[PDB]
Amino acid sequence: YPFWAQQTYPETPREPTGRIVCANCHLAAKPTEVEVPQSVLPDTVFKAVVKIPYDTSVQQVGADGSKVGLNVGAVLMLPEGFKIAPEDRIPEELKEEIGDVYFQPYGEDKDNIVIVGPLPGEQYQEIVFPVLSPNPANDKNIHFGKYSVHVGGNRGRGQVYPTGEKSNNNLYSAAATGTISKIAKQEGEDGSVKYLVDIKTESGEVVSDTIPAGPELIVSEGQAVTAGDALTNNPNVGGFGQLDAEIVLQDANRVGWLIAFVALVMLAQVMLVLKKKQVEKVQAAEMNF
Amino acid sequence: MANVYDWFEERLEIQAIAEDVTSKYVPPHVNIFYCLGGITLVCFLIQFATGFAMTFYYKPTVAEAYSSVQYIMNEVNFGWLIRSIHRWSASMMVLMMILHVFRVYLTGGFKKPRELTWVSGVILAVITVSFGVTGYSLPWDQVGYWAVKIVSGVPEAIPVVGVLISDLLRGGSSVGQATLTRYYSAHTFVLPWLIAVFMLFHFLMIRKQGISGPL
Amino acid sequence: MATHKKPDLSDPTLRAKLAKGMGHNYYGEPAWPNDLLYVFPIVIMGSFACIVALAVLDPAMTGEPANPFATPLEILPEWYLYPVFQILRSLPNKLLGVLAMASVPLGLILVPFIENVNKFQNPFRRPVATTVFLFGTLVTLWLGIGAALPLDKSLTLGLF
Amino acid sequence: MSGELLNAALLSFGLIFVGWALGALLLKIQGA
Amino acid sequence: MLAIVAYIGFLALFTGIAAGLLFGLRSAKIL
């Protein structure tokens, strides 16, 4: 989950390579999109839409094995100074679009690194972020310019837990080389289903390998395969997707003077063409060119 | 005051220059696409001006490069403007030059006797791209640094002189301070002089032979 | 209106120029001041105003400090080097890549010496040349777009 | 980052014809 | 919308400034 990111990787959700740390556990890749304004004025509230689409009709494997729907999560790394807009500054229309999203910072004084935990994918394939742009006028660390926006979006259950143990939502290979003699399915302490599998035909070790039910097997019985053959499959129907984007912290004064200069240029061009027009008539008269 | 113009006229022969200029004409087949070469020049003059401007604050050192670009963007008066213009005009120069080559080729203007103009043009294209590649890495950010670290090893493929070439370009066995120093000399000293020389030849030949004929 | 001067075909110095395809600044609209003084500043100001406009509305970015120990995801040169970059990464033979790269300017240099076989200027009177040019242009755009895509979608543009 | 690319292409392509049209128009009203 | 109205209105304005300066300067025996 997003909060497992800040647990394992507290300093930042972004590695020096630009790789977002979710990928360290959500090993599959699915498309993630973003929608940010090209430019925004300072001290303004604007919409930042992260999109984590997937096939709603396709379900995934739950912790036990049951076929269940999947949730979405995301991390939105904004530029310095940017942060989630205060509720009193978000218009009604935007409020309705957001929903029950619990925006929380990645850490103390990291208000620009927003994070959004588990949300029902059926209703949140498109997460809206109300964000407030900073103001260079009252913050010497903030200035107008173009800045990056890093976005990680995931759907579906991960593959690794913060401790190291693998989840049941991944593929399972064979332990070693030998003839499979066990498609046993025992249990005991905990609950629900489990499978016991083993091999041999001579070796240098006498142990077996259990697989947490959920994936589903495609191996029958008796076969001297090697160490690495897929004896289950890939139940995973989710995946994590990265994207970079850019936003311009614009200054109204810059654009204003721009409009004026543009107008001056167009005027000058007109006067030049008209001047030529005059000279054309003069040349037509006093034939001397 | 005793006529200053006649004074300058007698020794500069301004009248002769005026006669030479007003003796030229532009034929009907010369359409708007014949501006592209001039626009490429205009883009370069913008580079010359804004580039020079940035040498007053930019510092070609691994310690100071990135921060000097930050300083230009944040602290220097209109520094953000001068740099943004250098950036966009760098790309507009190459674009307009491509469109310029499209005009020249789809008009046969490169054929006898204007083939040295075309060859000097190709050389001008290589120089312009060299401008781009060297400037791209001057900020010494992730993008610029890794753009260099990739291409700087390419020439090693050449059998005998490959490693020597690559060492000359990067200033050593690997990319580092020496690389930044050589790239900066190239971007702000070598390439401006080279492009001036070959632009001089380009323009002298054009003015000598006039524009190619109608299609 | 519309100032024009006809070619003086009674002038053997002009005729000798035209014979060498080289007298086309002797006739037409007066270059000065008609174009030079009046129209040129329109083009200079125009291009300058478009560049400034782009510069203000979409200013230059400054990424993050270089890191020799961390290779970025997404690692491209500037757009005009996409075709060359595509070739360079997609060819297993590094030497052959360097040669293909060098072949671009060297190849363009040979153009005039290859198409001097005739004196035509209009592309409609040289369909073979126009075909080779359109082909290379399409192949270059193809290689350029491929550069921004994964290596697997390069030889197909992820379309088929 | 693709609809912006197509938008910019279409605009840089089509705005030229608008400027061409306006030029021809001004030519008509002056009496070319 | 606002972009389209502004674009057409900007060009229309300056096309009107062009025509205005044209016939305007003609009337004054300047053109």
Partner: peptide, 29 residues
Amino acid sequence: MAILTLGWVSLLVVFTWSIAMVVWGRNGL
């Protein structure tokens, strides 16, 4: 946020208008 839109519009307008003034001044194209 309207000033931003007008900002981009002005770019589109000088591009278009430059074309137009070159066509007018040079009488075609």
